[PDB]
Structure formats: structure tokens, C-alpha cells
């Protein structure tokens, strides 16, 4: 992930019997999460700033359908980014507390390498997929 | 006429509990908000006659 490239971070070198919560690791993950939260907040701000120029400048009737179409996508998108920030913040509370890293349905533990991939993961691969199946079935 | 919970509120209340001038200002701003987001200028004057 270009995520590790933007920062001067190199893939984490997990040692054989390496634990999970030391001074250095939580200080390390706190910075990443804070930096990650701060970037999204700047992204949400830039989005709102771009949307207002369109709302302030009035397009010509002919290009209204194209401007309106593009304005709606940003808005939908903007609201999506705001949800993600709240999700990371929720994940930032899981690090500080003591209930991070396990599937919420069954006590099974979620993988270490899996959590580095999606730190917002709430379920293990088995439980998450069945939920998507019921979803397609309970919906459609 | 204070907010005892949140969420949108019905205009029937605003007129009843808070006043003829309160609800009229509620409509004009909340409709103009939609038009003014789209760059359309409609003087409140018109929206007022409808109210």
C-alpha cells in the first residue's frame, strides 16, 4: 500500500514471540491513526470548499445537467468520507481501551496480518461473508 | 418553544407555540436554502405571499 510509502514507514518487522501492547507500539499506532484522522479531516474540508464554489458560481442552463450530476456525486462522496472518519475515531478508541482485535459475533480472534490490512475489521472472514449473503438475500 | 429533543420539527408547532413571524421565517429560509444551493435567486417577497 502506497500508505506505507507516503510515510517513511517500512512494513512492520514482527518478531517471533512479539506481543501486542508496548509503549513504542501504541505510540507508533497512535501517531498513524492521528495522522490518518488529520488527513481525512483535511480532505473533507477541501471537498466542502470545492462544492461551495460550484454553489456560488452559477452554470449556464445547458451545462446545468452536467454540473448538477457532478455536484451530487461529491455530496454523496463527502458524506461517505465523514462516516469513515467516525469509524477510524471509533477504532482509535479500541486501541486506547482493551477490546480491539477480535470478532464481535464469536469469540474467535481476528488475524494479526488481517488487522494490519483493515484495522476497522469487526468480524472474521467466516462471519463477515455470511452476513453479506444474508444481506443480498434479506434485501433483494 | 425550546428544543426538547432533536430532529426536524413540524411547521404546525412553530406557528402555534412560537408565532406567526417564526414559521414564516422558517419556510422562507428553508426553501431558499434549496434554491440558493443551486444558484437560483428568488426574492423572499414571492415566498412570503405564498405563506
Amino acid at each position: 500500500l502506497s500508505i506505507l510509502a507516503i510515510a517513511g514507514v517500512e512494513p512492520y518487522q514482527e518478531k517471533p514471540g512479539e506481543e501486542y501492547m508496548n509503549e513504542a507500539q501504541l505510540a507508533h499506532f497512535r501517531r498513524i491513526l492521528e495522522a490518518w484522522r488529520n488527513q481525512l479531516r483535511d480532505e473533507v474540508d477541501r471537498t466542502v470548499t470545492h462544492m461551495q464554489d460550484e454553489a456560488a458560481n452559477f452554470p449556464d442552463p445547458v451545462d446545468r445537467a452536467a454540473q448538477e450530476e457532478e455536484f451530487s456525486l461529491e455530496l454523496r462522496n463527502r458524506d461517505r468520507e465523514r462516516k469513515l472518519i467516525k469509524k477510524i475515531e471509533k477504532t482509535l478508541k479500541k486501541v486506547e481501551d482493551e477490546d480491539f482485535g477480535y470478532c464481535e459475533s464469536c469469540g474467535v480472534e481476528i488475524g494479526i496480518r488481517r488487522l494490519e490490512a483493515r484495522p476497522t475489521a469487526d468480524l472474521c472472514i467466516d462471519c463477515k461473508t455470511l452476513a453479506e449473503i444474508r444481506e443480498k438475500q434479506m434485501a433483494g | 418553544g425550546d428544543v426538547i429533543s432533536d430532529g426536524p420539527e413540524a411547521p404546525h408547532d412553530i406557528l402555534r407555540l412560537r408565532g406567526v413571524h417564526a414559521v414564516t421565517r422558517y419556510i422562507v429560509n428553508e426553501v431558499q436554502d434549496v434554491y440558493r444551493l443551486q444558484g437560483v435567486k428568488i426574492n423572499d417577497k414571492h415566498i412570503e405571499v405564498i405563506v
Partner: peptide, 30 residues
């Protein structure tokens, strides 16, 4: 630019003014 004249039928022209731009608003929810 002068003040509104006696007899002008402002009810209609009010209505008209609001309803013309209805084409420029989005019909979803946004």
C-alpha cells in the same frame, strides 16, 4: 424599479417566480 402598482396581480407572479426554476433542482434528496 418603482413601487408595486395598485391592481398588479402579485399572487400569480409570486407563484410563477418560484415554479419556473423547479427544473434546476435535483429530484432525489441530495
Amino acid at each position: 424599479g418603482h413601487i408595486i402598482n395598485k391592481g398588479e396581480a402579485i399572487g400569480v407572479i409570486a407563484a410563477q417566480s418560484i415554479g419556473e426554476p423547479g427544473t434546476q433542482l435535483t429530484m432525489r434528496t441530495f
